[PDB]
Design a protein around this nucleic acid. Structure first.
Ligand SMILES: [Mg+2]
Ligand SMILES: [Zn+2]
Length: 2008
RNA sequence: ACGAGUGUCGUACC
RNA sequence: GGUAGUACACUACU
RNA sequence: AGUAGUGUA
């Protein structure tokens, strides 16, 4: 941890050049890690630190009286010992990831100490403390030791040692001897998976083709390699080395040629520019005109928004019946003649209620009351229309189509030519997007929309989002709050809210619409209506009707049918719209999308116009068509390529960009993109980089400058680069998934697949070539690279085969693998004609391969039941299937993604799944070792990897450039020399691969299989036979696609499908070279990595020819490549290098069969983009807008709480990806609004709970009771929706704890709960506490409990609606048929249930046996929810059903009442009322409050830590986020009590045998003991037994299913208790790098409070608590950390800012009276003295005496006499630094000065400076000399306490005169130009005192000339009289900080001028209490306009005038 | 009419 | 020409 | 363990 020791290790690594000493380096590194952990553990435990203390020594120490030689002490050396309570504990520190060494050392030490334990009559305990370096989880075996130490708070980081190990291994990676020397064990191969290999593989036609393709020597080499057995051979790498040596000549020749190409390359690469963009645009428009039908008519446009809107009418009433009457009258009174005017008038007559409004209301109310009285739908009773006036009414807003009221001809005209009901190869018609008239029409449309919608609403901006989240959003960003207020005031919000409400009403009324009825939908607007036409994927037909007084005052986005005159104005009818419920639901959610988009685009940008942003967002948010889809996604490639250094944007536009402009908005956005391309080319040079700050240990202040110089894209303004990237990339997420149509997408996907297959069949005939032919692989280079990479990878780890089998469950059963037991679909081949009934297709097409789709688990059940599969180890069965399954069949379906063209998705059969599983797991485990591979990297860690690569490339650039240009810089401190100096080049190739799986040479994987060392020859033969049979796979065409292709009746021109299928005579097509998408990810990625390694070699050699330095980092996921190249050379310009690098990148991709997408491949100098993730310049960046937009996404629609928890997930992910707090809060508000809208809980609505509960606002109601979340954003991110209860409890603590403990730790504050008075609690608090006590917890719980259930062990759902829903067909499931047979079997259920009781662990864990699996599969069918999931369900239909059933009795209140002490289903409102009634009778007591606190907070260490962070937080100096970084969330529960896996522990507990398969005998015993203790102390077994007994007695018969359910919850709780370290991968973008839990919490809290700036957070006490997950914590930690921080801060502050002489007196004075963090510093000093950590404060102790020479001896042991020390420190006056020897220096570690604000004490008055305020000073404590000398007199005036000082020179004497540090910045001279700033030791003239002197002189001169009221000067007697007047004035009035700072500044000026005597003699002038003339004088004050004091003097005068006027 | 489409579709049926 | 089972939301500062 | 959702390729 020590930085000097880190430097020492770095020097050892750098200077080392022998692999024999690198082992010494690594061993020393491991010892340093162990000793560091031991020292930190001893500090935490507060025990004296020892290492390898002799056992005889410890025996003598514990028993000095006994004579030595009484017994031979064992030679073992314990790390440390501890003797308390007559028990000796032998402690051993271990820093390992495993327990093998721990257990063997435990056994050895125990055996060797038994004899001494018996003799000396002392029990000896062997305690092994083990820490896991990668996840800091502590493991302790001795429970007695853990009893001694209840809280162990070891919080340390091992990242430094990992970095050194990585540096050593990368330096000596090329040395195979070093790898062998550091290898663990030898090369070991497990037992062969198969006993025999395929003999028919050699006869396979595919193998014959491959063999004939290869030349003869390669055929021989392939046969030898596949027939090679590593275990039999003397060396495993015998054949690998032979092949590598054979191919070395060709490999070296290829590398040398490719390197020689650098000279032949010119400087001209594919630069994007305006000419290329224009030519590409011309080619694109030509291609689009050829492929489409271009229309120049505006009347051919399609609706941009399927809606028309008009402002409301304040004069008219908003009652529903009045609106209906008004609509009927307006429809009837249409004047004029038109096509449908008579139909509209007839409809208005049909809906004419007349004057019988009361009768209509009564009829509708009676119907609704009848409907709502039943949980189920009312059946068998027919609704009969009632005639009211001329209206035949069936329901509210439902009317008959009366044949008498409408002519038949008019009715058919309307229904067919208008609504399309009863209605009934050319090119798709699209508008001309390049036509000037068409673009002018689009501009006119957008201008009209802006004009109509920019006006004010005229109504209150009050709404749910604002009311419930305005405070949070305002505190986060007042500007965001103001933007929201403006948005809600404008008319865009009213229009989109009206459209959403109206569309929800349309969806509600369309469910029960009949064929002869039409519905009327109404919204809050009294002028906007909807008429829903009859309808039967369900569709909705609606027409929007708008009433407006003035014509042309309507908002028409190309949806209007016509505007007609009526009574009292005009009526406008929109054209009929037919939409899918999926698009309708998006429209309903659209307000959230609109608000999110507007706030994202406007955030932190004053140069943008909110009107323009909303004008764009209203169209993108409501876009539900493919027209905008065709533009959003290609825009990324177009604009990003244009900004790039090298890109083929011209070819991209010409060949791929295909705008689909069916709408005027699409035309407008096409023009926007076109302009943005040229602008992006023009403005690529305005990107600038921040000044890098390098500390040589970490990088801070890195990235890209924030200057708004780039032009905005979609709307006028200026943006930063980050905002520009957001504007480029966010629009892709405006698209909607599932917009495609199955018919067309199946046709296109089949066409693409068959076209690729046909092209491969015809054109592609060569497999191996040397000239980089398309779809061809260079054989020699491939083989050589594969050999090299395989050698390196398998040399890295010696047990690769064992690791594969262990991690992939190869040795375990088939039923224990998730991918083989899932509910995903799989293909089944065979005769299934009966189930499928299709008949016509079967008869008409002979060669039809019959197939059916089934679930994976069902297929596994079938194969197990038919004995095709067994429960033997899975790998043996997999290889058996590799031989048996000769024919592979696949089918495909469309993904339905959000891109313009859908993606084909392939489904395979079970045997193919298993074979590919084996191959892919082998490839995966070899990819894990390779650093370049990125699929093996867990998700979201790729951001951290990108950051690390960028940081090391920055460091390499700086170091290499400085090292090379040292000579030139020395010569400078010449222009000709500067010309010839070396320059740095940085290159980022963000690349894409074209047709990764479609066009790939599958033969290159044969070599990967054959050259693999870890496989046996028989395994290789079987796998190669599988691959050969895979290359003969057949694609089964889908039945629906075949149906449509057979129902055409007109022959297609060139039907590729018919050609490939023999004129539709077969449904199967043979696919050979296209390994199917997604099946061979790891293998393809490995070969991609090998290709990039060859590229790296080529680049390194080529740069070697240039005598330069290069660093190449390549990241490869599957087909997405991120290659960054850093070059520092001087021979040639950068253009030649860029051209050469790009040409060789393309050539290297083509060499290995890959093909880079040059259209989508672009080169940048700074920006990295690997997988939707960006690294701007060392600084991580991500588009969190996608997570922000997914806040309104679909959910399970289970209930109000379940729905909310799903969307808070998206909010939290957005927070993790860098979303600012205000936008995160907006997303949370939108999620709450969406849920409340779904369940009709919005304010004022029926299910709104605010009235029924004692709460002022919905923040007071619990989430489970339908409140809104109220908690800090850091809490929401960390604990995740438990934050509601946590925040409520913390607020209760902060409100009711006594003042003495108010600033104590959470455990102490909870211990003080017994003193609470329950009578003082408010009604809301009482209600919430009762809810927590009785609804969340159990009545049996007692405050005396020591262990209890954690919040993760219990659910939170209370009010969940129930639905009467049919299960579905489920006919095709063989397992379901077996389950039905078993159910119909006599009593089979009792046996199956009995088996599940006998093996209860099967309920929660996977079974390890076929019988166990088959029983579980049969059992799951009992649960209704599983069957519902099995049936396909539409989320759109579920959402509408939840809306409709909101008033029906759905809540089962019996279950809720069963929760507390001791009917029919109930509605939401009645449930609220009943819950309040039930809770009224219950009582609450201090005992109950203690139970709540103990069971909610004291259980979880994470909950305790979060509560401590909230209570004890101190917020420091604000600062702008300069350089961000990634940091993963650490583990909050470090202590581990269970070692074994939870499944194994549960299996052992179900039985009583600690000895289980795969379970360590003795290790499982303690886990079983712990689990039994947990069960007994929580009384789970007793509670379950009592519950089942009571239920059995109540029912009268044994409810066996109830017993199963009880066992399920019991084992669920047991599983949650015994769950081990999950170690989730959760990374965060944070202002700084965090290493420990406290650092992470500080960074989270400081980052998630304000949008503008982030704060430094330190904690008053120690936040972390040492405890276990389910054990109560009643012990708080010590204050030693506070003492350490205090005295480190004190020593270093005194050294830095105090003169050498005054330092000791300063220390003594501050020790005597001051206090740190509410703790007296004398007490902290006593803690340090009377403690076992005194070697960290040797200089501090020396200055205060102490030492006693024991500390010096201990320090020497860590590596010196007292008098020698005293003599040596004669010249040194440093409090923090002392010299024990002539060169040895004992020092105290530094602490950040931001914590100095925690010191409180009496003033330290010396000279005129009061040092207390200096410690409290914020500006003047900075270490940099420049920053100190450049501070202001406003800050400096705080330190002035003169009381009669004459000279500032003697006043400032009490300041440090040692040299300070200053930041010197230098340029780098690289193609991306940037400056690095590094602090360096300054010379003598720059000291703290000198900086203060310069500050004083400059600022006082400025202030003097600012306040020379008289012309003579500052010292003139008249000016002095004016100063006397002003000081008397300010003394006479109330003190203000303006007055104080002005007084201090004038005082310091007078001290400089030596006017102090009169200053202290200032009094009221004799000419002056005439307040009138004081006012006259101050109003006559000649205030100057000097800029710093201009605002200051005016404010001071104004405040004085206001105060003196308020006085009178 | 609307959704989709350089694949004949959905658009309630006999 | 005839046929076309199918119980309910919003109801508002507008 | 099952189910749902989201992001990624
Ligand atoms: Mg990419
Ligand atoms: Zn003074």
């Amino acid at each position: 941890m020590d930085y000097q020791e880190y430097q020492q290790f770095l020097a050892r690594i750098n200077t080392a050049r022998d692999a024999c000493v690198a082992k010494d380096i690594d061993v020393d590194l491991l010892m340093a890690r162990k000793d560091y952990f031991g020292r930190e553990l001893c500090k935490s435990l507060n025990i004296e630190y020892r290492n390898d203390v002799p056992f005889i020594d410890i025996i003598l120490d514990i028993r000095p009286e006994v004579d030595p030689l009484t017994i031979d002490a064992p030679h073992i050396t314990p790390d440390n010992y501890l003797y308390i309570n007559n028990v000796l504990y032998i402690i051993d520190y271990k820093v390992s990831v495993s327990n093998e060494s721990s257990v063997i050392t435990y056994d050895k030490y125990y055996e060797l100490t038994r004899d001494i334990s018996d003799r000396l009559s002392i029990p000896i305990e062997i305690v092994i403390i083990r820490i896991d370096p990668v996840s800091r989880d502590l493991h302790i075996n001795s429970d007695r030791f853990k009893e001694l130490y209840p809280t162990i708070v070891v919080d340390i980081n091992f990242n430094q040692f990992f970095d050194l190990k990585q540096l050593l291994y990368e330096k000596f990676g090329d040395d195979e001897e070093f790898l062998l020397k550091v290898a663990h064990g030898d090369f070991t191969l497990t037992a062969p998976w198969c006993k025999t290999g395929c003999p028919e593989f050699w006869k396979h036609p595919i193998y014959k083709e491959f063999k004939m393709s290869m030349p003869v020597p390669e055929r021989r080499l392939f046969e030898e390699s596949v027939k090679f057995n590593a275990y039999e051979s003397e060396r495993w790498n015998t054949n690998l080395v032979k092949i590598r040596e054979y191919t070395k000549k060709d490999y070296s020749e290829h590398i040398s040629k490719s390197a020689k190409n650098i000279f032949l390359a010119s400087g001209f690469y594919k630069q994007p520019n305006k000419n290329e963009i224009s030519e590409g645009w011309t080619l694109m428009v030509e291609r689009v005109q050829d492929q489409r039908e271009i229309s120049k008519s505006l009347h051919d446009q399609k609706p941009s928004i399927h809606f028309i809107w008009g402002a409301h009418n304040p004069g008219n009433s908003n009652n529903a019946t009045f609106k209906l009457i008004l609509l009927s009258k307006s429809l009837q009174s249409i004047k004029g003649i038109s096509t449908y005017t008579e139909a509209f008038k007839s409809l208005g007559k049909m809906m004419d209620i007349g004057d019988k409004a009361i009768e209509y209301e009564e009829f509708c109310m009676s119907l609704k009351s009848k409907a709502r009285s039943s949980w189920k739908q009312i059946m068998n009773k027919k609704l009969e229309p009632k005639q009211i006036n001329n209206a035949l009414v069936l329901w509210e807003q439902q009317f008959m189509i009366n044949n008498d009221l409408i002519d038949k001809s008019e009715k058919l005209k309307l229904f067919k030519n208008f609504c399309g009901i009863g209605k009934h190869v050319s090119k798709p018609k699209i508008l001309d997007f390049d036509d000037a008239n068409m673009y002018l029409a689009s501009l006119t449309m957008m201008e009209q929309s802006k004009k109509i919608l920019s006006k004010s609403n005229g109504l209150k901006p009050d709404n749910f989002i604002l009311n419930e989240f305005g405070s949070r959003i305002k505190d986060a960003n007042k500007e965001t709050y103001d933007n929201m207020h403006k948005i809600f005031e404008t008319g865009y919000w009213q229009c989109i809210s009206d459209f959403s409400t109206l569309m929800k009403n349309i969806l509600s009324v369309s469910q029960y619409n009949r064929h002869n009825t039409f519905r009327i939908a109404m919204c809050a607007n009294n002028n906007v209506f909807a008429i829903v036409f009859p309808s039967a994927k369900a569709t909705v037909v609606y027409s929007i009707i708008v009433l407006h007084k003035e014509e042309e005052n309507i908002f028409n986005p190309g949806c209007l049918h016509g505007t007609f005159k009526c009574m009292n104005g005009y009526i406008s009818i929109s054209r009929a719209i037919r939409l899918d419920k999926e698009r309708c639901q998006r429209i309903v959610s659209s307000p959230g999308l609109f608000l999110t988009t507007c706030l994202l685009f406007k955030h932190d940008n004053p140069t943008l116009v909110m009107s323009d942003i909303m004008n764009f967002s209203i169209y993108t948010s409501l876009s539900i068509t493919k027209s905008v889809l065709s533009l959003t996604e290609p825009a990324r490639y177009m604009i990003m390529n244009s900004l790039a250094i090298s890109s083929n944007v011209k070819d991209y536009i010409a060949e791929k960009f295909s705008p689909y402009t069916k709408t005027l908005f699409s035309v407008y956005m096409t023009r926007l993109i076109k302009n943005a391309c040229f602008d992006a080319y023009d403005q690529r040079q305005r990107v600038q980089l921040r000044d890098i700050y390098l500390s040589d240990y970490d990088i801070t202040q890195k990235g890209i400058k924030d200057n708004r110089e780039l032009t905005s894209i979609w709307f006028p303004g200026s943006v930063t680069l980050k905002e520009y990237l957001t504007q480029i990339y966010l629009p892709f997420y405006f698209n909607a998934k599932g917009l495609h149509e199955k018919h067309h997408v199946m046709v296109d996907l089949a066409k693409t697949i068959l076209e690729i297959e046909c092209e491969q069949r015809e054109n592609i005939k060569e497999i191996w070539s040397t000239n980089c032919t398309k779809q061809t692989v260079n054989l020699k280079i491939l083989i050589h690279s594969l050999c090299k990479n395989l050698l390196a990878d398998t040399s890295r780890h010696n047990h690769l085969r064992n690791r594969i089998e262990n991690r992939n469950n190869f040795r375990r059963s088939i039923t224990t693998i998730s991918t083989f037991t899932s509910s995903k679909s799989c293909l089944k081949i065979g005769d299934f004609r009966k189930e499928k009934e299709y008949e016509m297709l079967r008869n008409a097409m002979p060669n039809y391969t019959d197939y059916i789709s089934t679930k994976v688990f069902d297929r596994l059940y079938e194969l197990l039941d038919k004995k095709v599969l067994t429960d033997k180890p899975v790998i043996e069965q997999i290889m058996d299937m590799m031989i048996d399954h000769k024919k592979f069949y696949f089918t495909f379906f469309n993904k339905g993604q959000k891109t313009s063209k859908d993606r084909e998705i392939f489904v395979g059969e079970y045997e193919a799944k298993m074979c590919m599983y084996a191959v892919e797991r082998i490839a995966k485990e070899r990819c894990k070792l390779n650093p370049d591979e990125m699929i093996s990297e867990p998700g979201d860690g790729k951001l951290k990897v990108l950051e690390q690569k960028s940081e090391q490339e920055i460091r390499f650039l700086v170091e290499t450039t400085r090292q090379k240009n040292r000579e030139i810089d020395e010569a400078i401190e010449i222009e000709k020399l500067s010309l010839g100096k070396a320059k740095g080049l940085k290159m980022e190739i963000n690349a894409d691969m074209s047709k990764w799986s479609a066009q790939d040479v599958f033969y290159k994987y044969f070599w990967l299989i054959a050259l693999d060392p870890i496989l046996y020859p028989q395994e290789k033969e079987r796998i190669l036979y599988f691959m050969c049979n895979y290359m003969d796979k057949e694609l089964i065409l889908p039945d629906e696609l075949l149906f449509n292709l057979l129902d055409q009746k007109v022959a297609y021109q060139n039907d590729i499908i018919a050609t490939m299928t023999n004129q539709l005579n077969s449904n199967t097509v043979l696919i050979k070279r296209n390994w199917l998408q997604g099946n061979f990810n790891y293998t393809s990625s490995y070969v991609h990595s090998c290709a990039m390694s060859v590229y790296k070699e080529i680049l390194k050699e080529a740069i070697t020819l240039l005598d330069g330095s290069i660093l190449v980092n390549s990241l490869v996921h599957s087909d997405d490549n991120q290659t960054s190249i850093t070059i520092v050379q001087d021979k040639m310009e950068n253009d030649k290098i860029i051209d050469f690098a790009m040409k060789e990148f393309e050539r290297a991709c083509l060499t290995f069969g890959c093909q880079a997408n040059m259209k989508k491949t672009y080169v940048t100098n700074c920006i990295k983009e690997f997988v939707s993730l960006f690294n701007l310049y060392g600084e991580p960046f991500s588009i969190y807008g996608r997570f922000l937009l997914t806040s309104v996404g679909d959910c399970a629609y289970i209930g109000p709480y379940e729905d909310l928890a799903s969307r808070i997930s998206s909010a939290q992910t957005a927070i993790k990806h860098g979303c600012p707090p205000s936008l995160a809060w907006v997303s949370i508000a939108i999620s709450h609004w969406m849920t409340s809208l779904t369940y009709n809980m919005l304010p004022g609505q029926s299910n709104d709970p605010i009235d029924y509960f004692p709460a002022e606002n919905r923040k007071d109601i619990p989430i489970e009771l339908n409140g809104v979340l109220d908690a800090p954003l850091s809490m929401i991110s960390t604990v995740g929706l438990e934050s509601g209860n946590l925040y409520f409890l913390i607020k209760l603590l902060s409100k009711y704890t006594p003042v003495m403990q108010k600033r104590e730790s959470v455990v102490n504050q909870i211990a003080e709960v017994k003193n609470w008075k329950v009578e003082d609690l408010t009604d809301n608090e009482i209600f919430r506490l009762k809810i927590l006590r009785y609804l969340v917890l159990d009545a049996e719980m007692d405050p005396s409990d020591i262990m209890g259930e954690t919040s993760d062990m219990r659910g939170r759902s209370i009010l969940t609606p129930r639905k009467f829903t049919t299960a579905g067909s489920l006919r095709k499931l063989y397992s379901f048929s077996k389950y039905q047979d078993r159910l119909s079997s006599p009593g089979g259920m009792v046996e199956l249930f009995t088996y599940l009781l006998e093996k209860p662990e099967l309920l929660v864990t996977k079974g390890e046996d076929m019988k166990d699996y088959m029983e579980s599969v049969i059992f799951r069918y009992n649960s209704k929810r599983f069957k519902e999931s099995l049936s396909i369900q539409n989320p759109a239909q579920l959402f509408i059903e939840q809306i409709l059933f909101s008033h029906k009795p759905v809540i089962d209140f019996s279950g809720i009442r069963d929760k507390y002490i001791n009917l029919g289903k109930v509605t939401f409102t009645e449930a609220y009322r009943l819950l309040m009634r039930d809770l009224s009778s219950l009582e609450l007591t201090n005992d109950d409050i203690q139970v709540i606190y103990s069971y909610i907070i004291l259980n979880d260490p994470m909950m305790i830590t979060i509560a401590n962070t909230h209570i004890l937080s101190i917020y420091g100096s604000p600062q702008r986020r300069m350089g961000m970084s990634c940091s993963t969330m650490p583990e909050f529960r470090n202590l581990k009590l269970i070692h074994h896996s939870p499944a194994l522990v549960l299996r052992a507990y179900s039985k009583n045998n600690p000895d289980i398969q795969g379970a360590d005998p003795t290790e499982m015993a303690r886990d079983l003991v712990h689990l039994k203790e947990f069960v007994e102390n929580t009384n789970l077994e007793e509670k379950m037994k009592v519950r089942i007994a009571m239920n059995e007695a109540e029912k009268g018969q044994r409810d066996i299913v109830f017993e199963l359910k009880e066992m399920t919850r019991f084992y669920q709780v047991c599983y949650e208790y015994v769950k081990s370290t999950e170690h989730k991968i959760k990374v965060f973008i944070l202002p700084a790098k965090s290493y420990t839990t406290t650092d992470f919490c500080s960074l989270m809290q400081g980052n998630l409070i304000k949008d503008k700036e982030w704060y430094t957070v330190h904690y008053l006490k120690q936040i972390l608590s040492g405890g276990h997950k389910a054990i109560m914590q009643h012990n708080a930690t010590s204050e030693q950390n506070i003492a350490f921080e205090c005295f480190k801060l004190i020593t270093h502050f005194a050294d830095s800012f105090i003169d050498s002489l005054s330092r000791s007196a300063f220390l003594q004075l501050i020790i005597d009276e001051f206090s740190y963090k509410d703790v007296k510093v004398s007490k902290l000093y006593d803690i340090i003295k009377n403690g076992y950590n005194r070697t960290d404060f040797i200089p501090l102790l020396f200055r205060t005496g102490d030492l006693r020479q024991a500390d010096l001896d201990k320090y020497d042991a860590m590596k010196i006499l007292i008098r020698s020390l005293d003599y040596l420190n004669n010249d040194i006056f440093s409090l923090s630094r002392i010299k024990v020897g002539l060169d040895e220096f004992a020092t105290i570690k530094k602490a950040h000065f931001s914590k100095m604000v925690s010191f409180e004490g009496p003033p330290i008055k010396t000279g005129l400076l009061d040092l207390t305020e200096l410690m409290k000073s914020q500006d003047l404590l900075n270490l940099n000399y420049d920053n100190i000398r450049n501070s202001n007199l406003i800050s400096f005036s705080k330190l002035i306490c003169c009381e009669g000082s004459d000279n500032i020179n003697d006043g400032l004497e009490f300041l440090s005169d040692d040299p300070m540090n200053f930041t010197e910045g230098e340029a780098i001279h690289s193609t991306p130009i940037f400056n690095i700033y590094y602090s360096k030791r300054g010379e003598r003239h720059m000291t703290y005192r000198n900086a203060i002197k310069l500050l004083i002189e400059r600022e006082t001169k400025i202030f003097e000339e600012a306040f020379t009221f008289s012309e003579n000067g500052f010292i003139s007697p008249e000016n002095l009289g004016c100063l006397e007047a002003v000081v008397s004035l300010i003394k006479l009035l109330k003190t203000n900080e303006w007055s104080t700072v002005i007084d201090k500044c004038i005082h310091i000026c007078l001290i400089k001028n030596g006017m102090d005597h009169m200053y202290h003699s200032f009094d009221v002038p004799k000419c002056f209490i005439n307040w009138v003339m004081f006012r006259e004088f101050i109003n006559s004050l000649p205030g100057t306009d000097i800029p710093p004091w201009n605002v200051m003097t005016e404010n001071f005068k104004k405040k004085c005038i206001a105060l003196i006027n308020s006085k009178f």
